[PDB]
């Protein structure tokens with residue numbers, strides 16, 4: 001799953017097998033690293049725009065500012081809605097995508113940018 | 116050694132600073148800046164004369 | 167004592183729990199049966215206590 | 217506690233008794249305690265030790 005996107009002013013970040021449904025049982029990490037004094041602007045492109053009536057687990061895309069499982073939780077995104085664009089100067093937006101044992105969806109498309 | 120205590124920073128109840136000073140704390144650490152700040156202040160250089 | 171240490175000495179694998187005793191002074195409270203597979207098939211190690 | 221001040225960056229170990237009523241950041245460094253003692257002279261006259 002690893003697409004090492006280190007040292008880019010901007011670049012493509014996306015779920016595996018993006019135009020297809022993402023594979024099951026996948027717990028793969030992604031890490032965004034910014035040089036000192038920079039700002040991270042994460043652009044996220046949803047594939048499908050619908051309004052869910054519920055929020056659930058089993059497939060969750062959370063965002064962290066710092067090392068994983070050890071930095072404060074920013075938010076934990078799921079469903080088919082496009083999350084709002086996240087602007088922080090924590091300089092380390094490290095993002096993990098999970099997978100349950102079934103029930104794949106349309107995946108996601110994102111774009112990281114550095115200033 | 117006897118106990119493994121931890122040096123943190125005091126902060127009041129529910130203050131928004133903890134959740135965002137720690138990310139600074141971690142940022143200062145992971146890049147090594149703490150080690151040099153550690154080094155630059157514990158650079159006492161009197162050696163242990165060998166016994 | 168272990169909680170005082172709290173991974174100062176709390177070892178995660180049996181086989182490399184052996185070498186902590188091979189290389190220094192250690193206790194490594196471990197189950198009876200695996201002892202017999204090691205102490206009988208390795209030297210320098212003894213069943214201690216009951 | 218009285219909010220008359222703010223985050224107090226100072227040597228203060230993250231202890232439970234403080235933690236119960238104090239909010240605390242992640243440790244910027246660890247801490248330990250140990251014996252601190254002078255180097256013993258350890259000298260016996262020896263001219264009339266016998």
Ligand SMILES: *[C@@H]1O[C@H](CO)[C@@H](O[C@@H]2O[C@H](CO)[C@@H](O[C@@H]3O[C@H](CO)[C@@H](O)[C@H](O)[C@@H]3O)[C@H](O)[C@H]2NC(C)=O)[C@H](O)[C@H]1NC(C)=O
Nearest residue numbers: 048049050051052053054055056057077078079080081082
């Ligand atoms: C009339 O049209 C509206 C859409 O304009 C229908 O709205 C849907 O209503 C349900 C509740 O009956 C919503 O579920 C709820 O969503 C809120 C916000 O997420 C949540 O806090 C509640 O716990 C509950 O899950 C649903 O989101 C909402 N939108 C959708 C998906 O259509 C409404 O049902 C229609 N009227 C009827 C009675 O058919």
Ligand SMILES: *[C@@H]1O[C@H](CO)[C@@H](O)[C@H](O)[C@H]1NC(C)=O
Nearest residue numbers: 188189204207208209210211
């Ligand atoms: C006991 O320790 C010595 C020194 O490491 C080693 O050479 C020897 O192989 C050990 N005992 C046996 C017979 O396994």
